Design an enzyme around this catalytic site. Sequence first.
Site, PDB file in Angstrom:
ATOM      1  N   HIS A 182      -0.674   9.266  -1.097  1.00 38.41           N
ATOM      2  CA  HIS A 182      -1.180   9.298   0.270  1.00 38.41           C
ATOM      3  C   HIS A 182      -2.189  10.438   0.445  1.00 38.41           C
ATOM      4  O   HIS A 182      -2.042  11.278   1.333  1.00 38.41           O
ATOM      5  CB  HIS A 182      -0.061   9.471   1.309  1.00 38.41           C
ATOM      6  CG  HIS A 182       0.953   8.386   1.419  1.00 38.41           C
ATOM      7  ND1 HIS A 182       0.905   7.471   2.446  1.00 38.41           N
ATOM      8  CD2 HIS A 182       2.037   8.082   0.701  1.00 38.41           C
ATOM      9  CE1 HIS A 182       1.926   6.636   2.329  1.00 38.41           C
ATOM     10  NE2 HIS A 182       2.630   6.992   1.279  1.00 38.41           N
ATOM     11  N   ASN A 202       6.568   4.581   7.258  1.00 34.56           N
ATOM     12  CA  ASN A 202       5.456   3.723   6.881  1.00 34.56           C
ATOM     13  C   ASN A 202       5.258   2.630   7.923  1.00 34.56           C
ATOM     14  O   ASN A 202       6.051   2.502   8.850  1.00 34.56           O
ATOM     15  CB  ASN A 202       5.691   3.081   5.519  1.00 34.56           C
ATOM     16  CG  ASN A 202       5.464   4.045   4.377  1.00 34.56           C
ATOM     17  OD1 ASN A 202       5.090   5.194   4.592  1.00 34.56           O
ATOM     18  ND2 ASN A 202       5.687   3.586   3.156  1.00 34.56           N
ATOM     19  N   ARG A 225      -1.003  -8.185   7.824  1.00 33.93           N
ATOM     20  CA  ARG A 225      -0.801  -6.797   8.221  1.00 33.93           C
ATOM     21  C   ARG A 225      -1.032  -5.836   7.056  1.00 33.93           C
ATOM     22  O   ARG A 225      -0.715  -4.653   7.166  1.00 33.93           O
ATOM     23  CB  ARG A 225       0.612  -6.589   8.776  1.00 33.93           C
ATOM     24  CG  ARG A 225       0.908  -7.413  10.021  1.00 33.93           C
ATOM     25  CD  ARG A 225       2.117  -6.951  10.819  1.00 33.93           C
ATOM     26  NE  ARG A 225       2.333  -7.815  11.974  1.00 33.93           N
ATOM     27  CZ  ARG A 225       3.309  -7.673  12.863  1.00 33.93           C
ATOM     28  NH1 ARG A 225       4.191  -6.697  12.731  1.00 33.93           N
ATOM     29  NH2 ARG A 225       3.394  -8.512  13.884  1.00 33.93           N
ATOM     30  N   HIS A 239       9.909  -8.768  -1.717  1.00 34.65           N
ATOM     31  CA  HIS A 239       9.935  -8.684  -0.261  1.00 34.65           C
ATOM     32  C   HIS A 239       8.714  -7.913   0.242  1.00 34.65           C
ATOM     33  O   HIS A 239       7.964  -8.422   1.073  1.00 34.65           O
ATOM     34  CB  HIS A 239      11.252  -8.071   0.242  1.00 34.65           C
ATOM     35  CG  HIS A 239      11.592  -8.394   1.666  1.00 34.65           C
ATOM     36  ND1 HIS A 239      12.725  -7.908   2.283  1.00 34.65           N
ATOM     37  CD2 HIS A 239      10.972  -9.146   2.584  1.00 34.65           C
ATOM     38  CE1 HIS A 239      12.775  -8.356   3.530  1.00 34.65           C
ATOM     39  NE2 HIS A 239      11.718  -9.107   3.734  1.00 34.65           N
ATOM     40  N   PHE A 296       4.864  -8.814   2.263  1.00 31.85           N
ATOM     41  CA  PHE A 296       4.382  -8.128   3.457  1.00 31.85           C
ATOM     42  C   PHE A 296       2.965  -7.598   3.250  1.00 31.85           C
ATOM     43  O   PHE A 296       2.121  -7.719   4.137  1.00 31.85           O
ATOM     44  CB  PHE A 296       5.289  -6.952   3.840  1.00 31.85           C
ATOM     45  CG  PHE A 296       6.500  -7.312   4.662  1.00 31.85           C
ATOM     46  CD1 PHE A 296       6.780  -6.644   5.845  1.00 31.85           C
ATOM     47  CD2 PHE A 296       7.365  -8.315   4.251  1.00 31.85           C
ATOM     48  CE1 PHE A 296       7.900  -6.971   6.593  1.00 31.85           C
ATOM     49  CE2 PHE A 296       8.485  -8.643   5.000  1.00 31.85           C
ATOM     50  CZ  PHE A 296       8.750  -7.971   6.169  1.00 31.85           C
ATOM     51  N   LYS A 305       6.974   1.025  17.780  1.00 29.94           N
ATOM     52  CA  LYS A 305       6.066  -0.111  17.847  1.00 29.94           C
ATOM     53  C   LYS A 305       4.853   0.226  18.718  1.00 29.94           C
ATOM     54  O   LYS A 305       4.960   0.998  19.669  1.00 29.94           O
ATOM     55  CB  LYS A 305       6.784  -1.348  18.402  1.00 29.94           C
ATOM     56  CG  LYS A 305       7.949  -1.868  17.567  1.00 29.94           C
ATOM     57  CD  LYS A 305       8.229  -3.348  17.760  1.00 29.94           C
ATOM     58  CE  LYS A 305       9.433  -3.825  16.974  1.00 29.94           C
ATOM     59  NZ  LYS A 305       9.435  -5.297  16.798  1.00 29.94           N
TER      60      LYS A 305
END
EC number: 1.11.1.6
Lengths: 499, 499, 499, 499
Positions: free
Chosen positions: C72, C145, C200, C191, C195, C234
């Site tokens: 990062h 994340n 996204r 999984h 994503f 969110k």
Amino acid sequence: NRDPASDQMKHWKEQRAAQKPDVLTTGGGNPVGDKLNSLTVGPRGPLLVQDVVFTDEMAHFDRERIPERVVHAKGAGAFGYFEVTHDITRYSKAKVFEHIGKRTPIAVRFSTVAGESGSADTVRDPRGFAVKFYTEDGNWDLVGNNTPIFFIRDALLFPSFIHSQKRNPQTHLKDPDMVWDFWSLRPESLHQVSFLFSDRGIPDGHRHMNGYGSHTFKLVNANGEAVYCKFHYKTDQGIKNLSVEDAARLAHEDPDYGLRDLFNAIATGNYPSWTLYIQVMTFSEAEIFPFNPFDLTKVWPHGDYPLIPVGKLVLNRNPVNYFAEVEQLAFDPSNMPPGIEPSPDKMLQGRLFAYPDTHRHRLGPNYLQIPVNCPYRARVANYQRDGPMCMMDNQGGAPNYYPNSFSAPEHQPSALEHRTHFSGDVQRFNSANDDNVTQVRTFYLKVLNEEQRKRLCENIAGHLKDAQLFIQKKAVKNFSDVHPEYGSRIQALLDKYNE
Amino acid sequence: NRDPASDQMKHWKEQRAAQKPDVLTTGGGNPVGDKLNSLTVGPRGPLLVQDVVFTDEMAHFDRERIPERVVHAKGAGAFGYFEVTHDITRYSKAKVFEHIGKRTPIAVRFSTVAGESGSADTVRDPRGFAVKFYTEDGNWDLVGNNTPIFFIRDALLFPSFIHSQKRNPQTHLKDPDMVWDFWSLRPESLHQVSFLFSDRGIPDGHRHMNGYGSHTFKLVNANGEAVYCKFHYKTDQGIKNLSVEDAARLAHEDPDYGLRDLFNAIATGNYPSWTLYIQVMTFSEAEIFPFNPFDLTKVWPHGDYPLIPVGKLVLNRNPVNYFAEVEQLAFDPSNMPPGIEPSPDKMLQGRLFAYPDTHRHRLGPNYLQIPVNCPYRARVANYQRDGPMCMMDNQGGAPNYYPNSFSAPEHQPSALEHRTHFSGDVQRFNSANDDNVTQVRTFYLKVLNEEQRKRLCENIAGHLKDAQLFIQKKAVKNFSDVHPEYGSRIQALLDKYNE
Amino acid sequence: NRDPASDQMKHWKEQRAAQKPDVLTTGGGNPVGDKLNSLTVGPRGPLLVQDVVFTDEMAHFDRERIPERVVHAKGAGAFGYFEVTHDITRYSKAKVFEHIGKRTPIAVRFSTVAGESGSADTVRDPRGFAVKFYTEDGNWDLVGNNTPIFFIRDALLFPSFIHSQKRNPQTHLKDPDMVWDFWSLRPESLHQVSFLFSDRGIPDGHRHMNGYGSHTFKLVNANGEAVYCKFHYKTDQGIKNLSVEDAARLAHEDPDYGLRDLFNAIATGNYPSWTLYIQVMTFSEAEIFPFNPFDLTKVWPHGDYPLIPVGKLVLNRNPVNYFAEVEQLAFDPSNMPPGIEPSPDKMLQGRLFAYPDTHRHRLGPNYLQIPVNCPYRARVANYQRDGPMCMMDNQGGAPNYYPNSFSAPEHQPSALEHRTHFSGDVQRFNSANDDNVTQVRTFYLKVLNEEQRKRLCENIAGHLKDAQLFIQKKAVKNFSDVHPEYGSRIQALLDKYNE
Amino acid sequence: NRDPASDQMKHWKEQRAAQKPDVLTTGGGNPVGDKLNSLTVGPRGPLLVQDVVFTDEMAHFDRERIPERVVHAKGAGAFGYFEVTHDITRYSKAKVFEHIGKRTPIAVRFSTVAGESGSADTVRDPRGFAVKFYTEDGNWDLVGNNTPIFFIRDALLFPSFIHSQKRNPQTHLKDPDMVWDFWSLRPESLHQVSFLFSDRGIPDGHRHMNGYGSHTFKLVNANGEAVYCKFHYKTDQGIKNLSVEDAARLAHEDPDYGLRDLFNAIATGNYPSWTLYIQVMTFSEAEIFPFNPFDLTKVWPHGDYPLIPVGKLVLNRNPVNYFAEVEQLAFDPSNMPPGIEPSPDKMLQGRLFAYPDTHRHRLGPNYLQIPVNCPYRARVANYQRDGPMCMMDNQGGAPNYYPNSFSAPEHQPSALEHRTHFSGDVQRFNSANDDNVTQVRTFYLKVLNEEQRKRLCENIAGHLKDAQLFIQKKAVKNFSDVHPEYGSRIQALLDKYNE
Ligand SMILES: NC(=O)C1=CN([C@@H]2O[C@H](COP(=O)(O)OP(=O)(O)OC[C@H]3O[C@@H](n4cnc5c(N)ncnc54)[C@H](OP(=O)(O)O)[C@@H]3O)[C@@H](O)[C@H]2O)C=CC1
């Protein structure tokens, strides 16, 4: 003519006498025309930047020093070999013990605990005794002391203890009030303190003292069965100590009494040696053992658990360059070969993290790539890459992730560690009030004679006399908890020194 | 079947097909039993400290990174040799030029200037071109660019100039106003700016560009006679550029277009070559030279000073591990063997200090003992000792002070520097108002054709439009000072871009 | 007239017009006479060492760089406050959640995963979302994340996973063989891979994405009762994504699209905000959960576990200096105030060690005394001393050892942790084949519509295209285990990409 | 009731009696529940990783140490003020000398030269006397010794001299052959050696010695007129020395005799002070001076150049935390405020590079932002940015390049330096054969009486006797070159010491 230590440069010249002197160069390998004179404009003019000879030498001089060891700074060094003389393959499957007669290269460093780089050698303190074994299954680091026990039994107290033994944060002086205030509030130090203030607190050099692993370790054999063990490597030269009178004279006369003494010994052929023993305890015997078998303030009595001989440690070589070979040494308790493992000893648990951490700071991220630290009798292959000061092929163009389908290094299933069952609340359990006196009482009454006890109380009283009266009265009663006469003998001495 | 770059791991498995995989060990050489699953209490329980396999793997990952280069961060590397083809021994006494035919090992690094480690290759910027020569008289580092000139001609303006080319101190963005606010206030940059925004700002890889030492250097022969020189090293592959149209497309499709290009070429036996030439100026010619012979914004015209060929540099080998061999490469202009010496160039004098300084930070004090940085074709002997990460014997027990009566290294009188005489006030002399336009005017009018002049101004206006209007008209003013037609062809376009 | 970010310098001058400019000084505060010209002997003579103005600036430029973040590296930062909206004192006793209306200062950092300091923002990769809370019970760092899940569920695979996501060790290029060799051998990643290659994967700026704590954590109330939880914050601005068409153009047109957007928003008053929710699971509900409740590859379904709202996160302040406030930000998962505690999650347990360690390397041993990292809302008093770059009184002449009879800081019993009981073998449990497909089978069929399933495979097939056929056939088979039509689609695209 | 130093902790608790002790916290500010017991599974179980209280503490204990000073490592500290008493504005325009009565905050460090961190205070060696003035025009570091001269007079011999004074690179012992072999091969040391082995080799603490700047410095007044000068500090407590007999006893009885003596003085109100004097020599008088006026081995006789009083230095405050306030002190001779400037002294010219260089390593790149190093009575503003451990606003969003059109800091033309013109070939000039005897012969015959010369030889012969015969004969011959009797007296004692 003088002792071998003083003739180091003398011998260096003669060992080279036949050859012509080499060309003096810069760090980039460029020969120098003049290195006694600076490049200036006119005889009395300012210096130039263009003089890259001056900058290169000076810039390196500026960066000569590294951070010293947080503890055990003052140190002597040597190299040698370990030879197995007895069979203990029923206990351990470690390659270092495979067969009788087998030799493995070692490295040893001696040290005090509290004194800095420039401190004296002949002072009352515990002695460091770290040994690195260069095995085929990687390095084995047995970082022991000249005592089987320590002052505390929880790793959270180690930073504290050390601070109490060093210099006041303001005045930068050694403070008796700091020293005893820790010890008086923590009676579990009464065991190791008793060791330190009688004869064996000041050993006559490094060759006249024993060395102990102190911590309990685990051994595992081929069959996958396990046992607990202690390590004791005892001197072949025999225990010999300094008196308080003349040990003080050496502090000013020859600050490096031990350092000189160790070097001189090897050079004149008298190679010092130690005999390595173990003690063994089964998991069943651990369950019925009166005290905690992983209390570091406790010994295993010889009556209940005799010594079993293993081999000899022999030092037969002096170091050529001290900094590159002794100051850059790094020992990690976490370095353990398959067959040897750590016990749930709380103090040992803390050393598994602490040592690898400080090395990465003191020496650097790639401190294991330094020659003396390198595991040169093993093949190092992994998925570790990069880091400051990478010195080798960096494992070439090999894949750097695991698992992979491209035949990079693989696990070895045989080398899995022992399986034990544990249960209980995950909680901070109080160990402050384990038995602090029983084994101490035994030491005082049974092991010392009438004059050794008399000298023991003199040495304490000569150091405690500088503390405050509430600290004195608090410590005495801690000594009284061992033996009434013991506490009272100390107290008789203090009452006249307080006028 | 794909390009050779992509089939690295496929090839690594083939070269090892007969072998079986290595024993995965810790950094301290101990084999690990399992390295995919953690040591826990129960199947869904917490992690233990006693897991030293995990701790030492994670701790080394933590410390993978070193500080990137402060400038020329993005880089590509290769290896090959230098071959002497002609005789220039009447000018220099350097062992690298001792006789025709002689080969010397080299190390090369290509780079952009401003962009960081993750930036695109195909952008408008100068290009770094460093060569390291491993001579018997130590390492020689020729640290050049793909331009004979630079943006400024004094060392104190360098840090300033760099900042302006990088990211804003609050917003951390590329900032057009910063770039041109500096360039317009320092009109000496006109020459290098005019070069940058031409076709050769964006070259088609590293194999299709020339290299230039830029600085004026000194050569000395056996008799003690001295001349000044420039180094011109031209491509054998011929100049070839990318348009801004496809350069922008390649920026997102392949960030490492140059890096792949160089590797693919060498791997397929397609070896890149460049010829080295020199221009020579006698001490007499220096005094009569119309401009400052040491001005880094000035060239020596070919008419008055033709090119003398020396030898070939060939790259024929790819690096095995990028980090160890290319990211740790160090180049020091101060690394100069006898026969080669510095001129009084203001900028070059600053680079003698800067490079050895920064490397001691980036890599470490003992960075010169890194393999790729090591002078392996010479013998290093001196009185420099210790420092963090000391990797050899540290020159044994050899005496560490000079002079000495114990036959430690001696200075070589042959290696003295060429002695020059100087005079003047010790003060800060203004270099702002040397001739800033004349050599630029010829490039525009004589060297470029009509179409190239058009694009030159389009590329500037395409970048300059993003600055403030008070900056724009001051920069435009400077462009008119070169030539009226040059300035307003730019100005006509900016006024278009200002809506 | 342009966006507020580009007018950073312009504003600074306007904000200071009334004031006179400061005196230009050395680092030591000495005023400089001239800083455009170097001190030389005569107009065309060599530089002097006596030029101390030059060295001071030149040397600090050389050490501008620090080691970048191992993962990062490319980042953006902002500041603001957390405000409580509902009362959940029944779940946590943490003072950050004491009563409705309470505000706490925060610090946030956004980031990619694989890209370096100069990489593109609009690329397919996960996005970091770390939040720091400055509570009175010390700093709390929730390092989350933009996804509820991750690729692996044991921390021993993390170093390996990252390597595969970065650059090849020889060629220094991104290699899809490394990518998909890892992913296909570890099908637990199915999984999170689903994503990432969905819509996204490329968010439209930092203000239009959700953020997850991912890990299961432990909450503790005033009575001593404990529950498990998940943290969700969110977006209030709404989810909005970039097309593969639009993301690629931006890569070259604006590499810092995310950094510019966030700065422009706050500067223009348009403040972005998130609503903080939790899920709760009792110790009871944990035992009966069909999957492993601490598996980082698993989510808690909303029907069975509804979201409970806590408060709002608002960013309302841009950083003043990027380096001092954003690049020197350090987040530690180990930072937890009384009331919040870790679960036995295998991945979270590793992060308790890894982060404080790496910060001592990257920034320094005293990284917690840097202003932006400091717990300035608590009073720091302990027995920790010294370290490089010690910046405060160093806690004065206070006693530095514990315990003591001199009234230095004491432990707080209220802050004791929750006691759990565990039982079982101590070994390495195999966790590779917990149910890897069921929840992924749910995602594909139930959450996505038919159009999004179509694009999902296309994004997969376009990047899997570069691998070897044997890696491809392995990946498709893994995907077939999720859903047969999902597997068959990807290979159906591959048969067209393989000509 | 005891001395004030030992009652530091006692006083610390009294100063706080009203207050309740603080809560013991981590570095992140989180309160700890217990810091006496570890987090384990059961009472005799293994340690957990989720225990972050242990790691946070232990990791900081691991990094407490920093590299000690390459020289003058052993130290003592104090603080106070400088007060002007006479007018010297006709020589210097420096703000520190502006008018009578003017105060400036100062910081002082005392030290020996060779001994490391732990060595004794009362040993024969030169003594450091560094003073740091905190002026309005930045910090002034006048870094002086307790002697007006030094052992060498070229900056390229300094590393070599130091290596010879310290420890042998193999044995790590102090080596008389290293010491005298050097001194005998460089006869210029005859002057300072004669001082070292006299009474004033071993001062009775730090309060009873004088201090000297040694170097010739430049002073410039408001008109731009210039003169050369020396700095002298004479003790207001009077010169006072230890006998070698008493200095040896204290070496073991009190290793920190000097350090505590100072602390005890200030605390009891008895504040030490020194009187600052200068000597002055015009540009006229410098050229007719019998010796080289910038020869560091030479004095200016008081007959020809008398002392001119300036002010008083007073120490009235002790350090609060030794490490933060004394160990991290950094003095740079290059730090000079307008009105004070360097002479062409070959040695002083070299000290302009070394001290800023070594500090960047020892402490770090931003070592001037440490409180005690910071110029807190001036405003630091410049175009230096970033760097490890950046601690303030980092000068905000200010423009980071120069020159600029945005009102960032500007040069101050009044603070340009005095301009001199020099000439002569640029070459390496030999300094070995300047007059080595005249001033020494003076010191022997004029200044010492019969008894002091007698001890001088005894103190020399006592140390030189341990060197080889070829070295003794070489050293004595250099002492014969000073005076026949001086040589003769030494050889008379050596013959008895050689049995
Ligand atoms: N059992 C052990 O491992 C050790 C026990 N002790 C002490 O002895 C007590 C009895 O032990 P036990 O084994 O039952 O009986 P033992 O009589 O067999 O123990 C004798 C041990 O005491 C050591 N010793 C003798 N004098 C001193 C001294 N001044 N300082 C330190 N150690 C000394 C001896 O070292 P050496 O063999 O070199 O003569 C020997 O190892 C214990 O309570 C403990 O305090 C001491 C050392 C280790």
